Amino acid sequence: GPRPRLWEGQDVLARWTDGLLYLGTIKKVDSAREVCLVQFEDDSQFLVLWKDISPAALPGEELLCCVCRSETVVPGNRLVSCEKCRHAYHQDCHVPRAPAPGEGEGTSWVCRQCVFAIATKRGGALKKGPYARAMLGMKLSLPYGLKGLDWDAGHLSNRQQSYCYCGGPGEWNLKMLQCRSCLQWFHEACTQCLSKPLLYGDRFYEFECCVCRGGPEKVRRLQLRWVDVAHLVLYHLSVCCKKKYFDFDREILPFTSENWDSLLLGELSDTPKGERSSRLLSALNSHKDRFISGREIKKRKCLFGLHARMPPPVE
Ligand SMILES: [Zn+2]
Ligand SMILES: [Zn+2]
Ligand SMILES: [Zn+2]
Ligand SMILES: [Zn+2]
């Protein structure tokens, strides 16, 4: 065709596996694999699926639905403009169907991409205000067909890499929650029900999504045991820091101490520090099936790391 949607040198927003949008520049378009090599603001380069790439509108493209690229307007399906990004959508090209002017619910209408761009946040999306309310509205619908997804055997990943309310990519074990009803996975940043950010690898939750609920999410934090605490802290640090071994006194205990309330430890919350340390140390030292230990006595280091790559079992 004479006018591709994407091209080398184009500035774009790309949705990452955390559901968030990052600014980048397209370096390569691969039409065989339907991906682009995108260079981000830290100069990192990654392949991104075309579905997860949004370019800006060119001058002269208010005539055009940004989804289907078409001019045409027919009765019942008009073009509507986003009052944020000023891109245009056919009512039926937007999910959910975009309201005709003056027929919306709030002060005004802003598109799904913009609502998510403004409302999603690391640690959990905005909970209060117009964008938070608009996001909840958007989240009652999915922008992809759930039933068509090609899942792996354990229902952890699908070939389309369509997850969550956003339809972005994602890694089930990295700050995502699985809905108990539809078994789809949802990003931390796209949810509105958490009181604290998720530990990587933490599945000690029960979750039900907005689509299944037909309204606000429901979530509950399950009770951890000390072995679960040790395993989850080590997993989280392993992911955050991309290394295997962590020093107890310099890294593990301070992390647990400094982030204590965020770990949502339930009944373990008032463990009095000295006992905090010894209980955690005991868990790390005693479960050799989970934890490998090491020593560097000349540096006064006591090291622990995980045996297994998989996140802690939920029991
Ligand atoms: Zn998401
Ligand atoms: Zn359209
Ligand atoms: Zn918009
Ligand atoms: Zn669900």
Give the length of the chain. 315
Ligand 3 centroid to Cα of residue 89, in Å, is 9
CB–CB of 13/117 below 8 Å? yes
Ligand 4 centroid to Cα of residue 146, in Å, is 10
Which CATH architecture fits 56-111? Answer: 2-Layer Sandwich (3.30)
CB–CB of 47/30 below 8 Å? yes
Ligand 2 centroid to Cα of residue 104, in Å, is 19
Residues facing 186 on adjacent strands: 177
CA-based nearest residue to 220, from 184, 195, 242: 195
Close Cβ partners of 272 (under 8 Å, ≥ 6 residues apart): none
Pairing of strands 205-208, 21-30: unpaired
CA-based nearest residue to 9, from 24, 31, 19: 24
Ligand nearest to the CA of 89: 2
Ligand 1 centroid to Cα of residue 293, in Å, is 37
Ligand 4 centroid to Cα of residue 199, in Å, is 21
Note if the bond before 96 is cis, omega within 30 degrees.
yes
Rounded distance between C-alpha atoms, residue 207 and residue 218, angstroms: 6
Ligand 2 centroid to Cα of residue 79, in Å, is 8
Q: What number of other Cβ atoms are within 10 A of residue 101's Cβ?
A: 12
Ligand nearest to the CA of 119: 1
Calculate the alpha carbon distances from 210 to 109, 137, 175, 215, 279 in Å: 21, 9, 18, 5, 38
| H/E run at residue 90 | strand 88-90
141: Cα separation from own chain's centroid: 17
Ligand 4 centroid to Cα of residue 174, in Å, is 18
Q: Is 9 left (phi over 0), alpha (psi -120 to 50) or beta?
A: left
Resolution (A): 1.9
**Edge-first strand listing for the sheet containing 246-247:** 246-247, 301-306, 291-296
**Ligand 4 ion: nearby residues, β-carbon < 5 Å:** 179, 181-182, 209, 212
Which residue is listed with tokens 């975009």? 98
What are the start and end residues of each CATH 3.30.40.10 domain in the chain? 56-111
CB–CB of 224/204 below 8 Å? yes
Close Cβ partners of 198 (under 8 Å, ≥ 6 residues apart): 175, 176, 177, 188, 205
Rounded distance between C-alpha atoms, residue 297 and residue 315, angstroms: 35
